[PDB]
Design an enzyme around this catalytic site. Sequence first.
Site, PDB file in Angstrom:
ATOM      1  N   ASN A  70       4.923 -14.067   8.568  1.00  0.00           N
ATOM      2  CA  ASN A  70       6.284 -13.472   8.377  1.00  0.00           C
ATOM      3  C   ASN A  70       7.309 -13.935   9.388  1.00  0.00           C
ATOM      4  OD1 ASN A  70       5.024 -12.096   6.327  1.00  0.00           O
ATOM      5  ND2 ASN A  70       5.071 -10.062   7.386  1.00  0.00           N
ATOM      6  N   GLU A 171       4.670 -16.978   2.314  1.00  0.00           N
ATOM      7  CA  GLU A 171       4.757 -15.741   1.480  1.00  0.00           C
ATOM      8  C   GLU A 171       6.172 -15.471   0.941  1.00  0.00           C
ATOM      9  OE1 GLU A 171       2.776 -12.415   3.405  1.00  0.00           O
ATOM     10  OE2 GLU A 171       0.817 -13.391   3.026  1.00  0.00           O
ATOM     11  N   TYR A 236      -6.685 -10.667   2.275  1.00  0.00           N
ATOM     12  CA  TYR A 236      -6.979  -9.636   3.263  1.00  0.00           C
ATOM     13  C   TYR A 236      -7.759  -8.514   2.566  1.00  0.00           C
ATOM     14  CZ  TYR A 236      -3.599 -11.944   6.397  1.00  0.00           C
ATOM     15  OH  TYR A 236      -2.864 -12.785   7.201  1.00  0.00           O
ATOM     16  N   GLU A 280      -4.578 -18.006   5.195  1.00  0.00           N
ATOM     17  CA  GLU A 280      -4.729 -16.735   5.916  1.00  0.00           C
ATOM     18  C   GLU A 280      -5.834 -15.942   5.273  1.00  0.00           C
ATOM     19  OE1 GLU A 280      -1.226 -14.272   6.360  1.00  0.00           O
ATOM     20  OE2 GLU A 280       0.124 -15.881   6.872  1.00  0.00           O
TER      21      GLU A 280
END
Lengths: 482, 482
Positions: A70, A171, A236, A280
């Site tokens: 981010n 993202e 995640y 990620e």
Amino acid sequence: SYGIVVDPKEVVKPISRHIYGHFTEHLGRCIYGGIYEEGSPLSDERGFRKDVLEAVKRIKVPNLRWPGGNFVSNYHWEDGIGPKDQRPVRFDLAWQQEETNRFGTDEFIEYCREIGAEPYISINMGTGTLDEALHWLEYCNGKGNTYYAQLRRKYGHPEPYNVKFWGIGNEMYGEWQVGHMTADEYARAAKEYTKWMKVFDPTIKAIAVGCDDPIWNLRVLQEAGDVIDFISYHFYTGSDDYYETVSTVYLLKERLIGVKKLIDMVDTARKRGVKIALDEWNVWYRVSDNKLEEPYDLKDGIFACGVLVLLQKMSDIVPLANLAQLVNALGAIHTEKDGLILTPVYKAFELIVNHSGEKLVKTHVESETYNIEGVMFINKMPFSVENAPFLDAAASISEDGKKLFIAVVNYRKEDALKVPIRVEGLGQKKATVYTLTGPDVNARNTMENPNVVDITSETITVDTEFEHTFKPFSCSVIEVEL
Amino acid sequence: SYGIVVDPKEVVKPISRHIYGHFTEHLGRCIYGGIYEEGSPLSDERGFRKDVLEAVKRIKVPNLRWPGGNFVSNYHWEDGIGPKDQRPVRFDLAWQQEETNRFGTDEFIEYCREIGAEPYISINMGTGTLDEALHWLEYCNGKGNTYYAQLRRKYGHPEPYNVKFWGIGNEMYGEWQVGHMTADEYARAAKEYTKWMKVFDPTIKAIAVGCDDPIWNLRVLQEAGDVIDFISYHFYTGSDDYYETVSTVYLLKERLIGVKKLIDMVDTARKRGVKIALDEWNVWYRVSDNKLEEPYDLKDGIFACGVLVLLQKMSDIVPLANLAQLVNALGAIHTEKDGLILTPVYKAFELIVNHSGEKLVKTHVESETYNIEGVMFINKMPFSVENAPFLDAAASISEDGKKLFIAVVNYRKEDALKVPIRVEGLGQKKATVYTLTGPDVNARNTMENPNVVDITSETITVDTEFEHTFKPFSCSVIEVEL
Ligand SMILES: OC[C@@H]1O[C@@H](O)[C@H](O)[C@H]1O
Ligand SMILES: OC[C@@H]1O[C@@H](O)[C@H](O)[C@H]1O
Ligand SMILES: OC[C@@H]1O[C@@H](O)[C@H](O)[C@H]1O
Ligand SMILES: OC[C@@H]1O[C@@H](O)[C@H](O)[C@H]1O
Ligand SMILES: OC[C@@H]1O[C@@H](O)[C@H](O)[C@H]1O
Ligand SMILES: OC[C@@H]1O[C@@H](O)[C@H](O)[C@H]1O
Ligand SMILES: OC[C@@H]1O[C@@H](O)[C@H](O)[C@H]1O
Ligand SMILES: OC[C@@H]1O[C@@H](O)[C@H](O)[C@H]1O
């Protein structure tokens, strides 16, 4: 009903060295207080924390992603170059803190050089422009007399850095991202930034943003599949339940086969061999703040082992992966002002990275399986997995063919598994089994007790056929000279 | 390097009986002069060709799709009911023929009942309407006093037909289709037709149009994935090259996996268990006219055995499939005024349908593989396949546990393959092996020579372990008691 058959003589495919990648974002104390801490008794004269540095060299990082995440979607790289005392202090919107920019491009590259990792830089498509991104590429990679190549030399680095991996935004679909875009916007912008960047330096690899929206992935592949090299995927997971956590290795597996199939459905992307970057991934479900100091336990470490074993078997499809993240933020390693803790997730890497080969060999596994429905992630989203195995494994050999590594995960929560193993053409030998486990599924390391969860070994005798007992909730690598 | 291990005691999953379905479109001579020929010395009093009836019953059709195909998209079903002499002659736009409508819904159902097949009716979404579809359904399935239920009774059939399978449109994406639609239009319309059809009869299964455009598939799944039961896939293939033909079994496989993954990516469709109907499939590359009398040879036969073996292994994902087509048009059976020819594609089904079980058992096959770049279909589109096997097999057991069927395809063009086979717990026993092949890969049956390509049988000895030698370009089933 459990069994492993390995044939060391049949090489299935290479194992991309970049599945073991890592990621450091300007988030919380990942950078400041983590890898970098100016004037600590524990830091060298560049400001790098030496105890951290040692922990990181130990896991042989092949490539390191920075600075976001981010963060990067509101980061202006030129704020982080030049004399440190002249770099402007900025408010970072992602994680809401003052950013002094005393760790910037040149320090990152110096960090990568120090640890032997390839730098992998994400660009700012949020508040950033094409010009700004081209300038960063020019600064990092230019050989000529352009202003930014000269500026690199001026600040002390005549040789180009040769950054090979560039992330084309982060993202960009999420409404939490600064400057977030619709699929059509982002697909057009990824094509645009990637093509001009490749005009300046055709050698770079470009990772475009992917997600769980198949329409988004398809617009990106359709629009930019002629120029990008990877489409990215973030994963995640986790809950308080042991099996809901570890079973998601196999949720991830199906997700990735999905994205691989979308790539197959777009001719230009298939024909160019666009691949996936899992740039990620981690357990993340307990902590939801601006520091993300997720206290990983052994359960989480088993998940991490399970993913590395998966990636060994699937690296032709997913050649690049990055754990999120290396230090403090979602941290594999946790630091305090006077020490550090190695979490079970770090241990997963310490195990697999140090005891694995460069080529995957034929590995057939027989296992009981289980179905599960649970929740994952900080929002506790329902998921389901069908026929998750209790036992998984990947056999690999070293480049020189002199060593066999049979990585084995026993996911069973309560029972050790007695597993018959056949290895073709192997004589009787002494071998060593390296095992990551601990006293219970929720065991953690602390500053108090740094070694509750660790890699232990024992020597055993192996043959063409033998049995080994694998502890419950454990990952083991059987290492054998050939 | 080649081998087959079967465990008859481990049932992996059911084999849906509907993978052996067929399809008869009002195209060329498939109906008129094919299954149906009024006043022929070879026809019964209903006008059904009795020689065709015998051949069709031999392959135990589980379901039969009708009336199209491209034809149904300009077909008004009410033109085909009531006293034949009063049915209007229509110009079919799809195949440019006068259609007398003397074969209509009541004759089709009667044909289905004769051969023992479930009717599968495709509706007209080209020039048709919602009401018209609902009226077809009410005519077929209503058991109350609605006008169209009464109308079926009036025309001679008081009991409902109970048609279970309804195709919501045919190839509505294609520019060749009358009334073709964009993805958004078709997606919305499929939801609309399917939901109201199911309000009137909630027991029907609805097949929505899929294709190779992944955005099309995903819009259909997103819009209608809460009501549909299958998304359809059509697959036509072939070229003059032997391996380029038979290898596309594995191209099919990958296509199907991709559609399966689209389903997984749409929450409602995944949760509801929407599956795939492969409702048109065959070789089709030589003929491009309005009759489609494709001269199938053995090579095309071995392709078809190969698809049947695949479908036995993937029938939980693809529970329904229909070869296109049954008679004359792309026809398994070819008719003339004075007889018929059973093509090698027909022999594929004559073999598998008669020698297969209802349950798929653990089957592991080892095989050498190849890569191929070829061309397929009438436009000679290039394709490529990676790691296709030279050998493949599937083992099934009968519902009552009494029999084991091991279907084996040897795709090798040049060499027989002596192959070791293991069957867990199998006594030493006698089996019968049924085998389909012929002199060469381009062998065909004719009126003159009807048995050049046929199924042979020999008794053999089997045991827990045995070897059998399989002819090149052949498919065989080993049929064992217990
Ligand atoms: O790794 C933490 C955050 O997770 C993802 O949402 C973002 O890319 C990263 O900033
Ligand atoms: O921040 C992690 C996020 O959870 C998922 O919804 C997002 O797409 C993924 O990136
Ligand atoms: O709730 C969304 C979770 O965040 C993401 O990483 C998980 O994959 C996604 O399902
Ligand atoms: O089987 C011939 C034609 O192929 C497909 O294109 C149509 O649905 C069918 O009419
Ligand atoms: O007519 C057969 C066709 O070839 C493909 O392009 C069509 O989609 C498929 O239906
Ligand atoms: O080239 C179009 C061919 O027709 C279809 O059946 C095949 O799948 C498609 O690739
Ligand atoms: O294998 C051949 C088939 O088995 C028999 O029942 C069928 O009639 C015969 O054609
Ligand atoms: O001819 C093949 C037939 O198929 C088998 O089921 C029958 O017993 C055999 O006669």
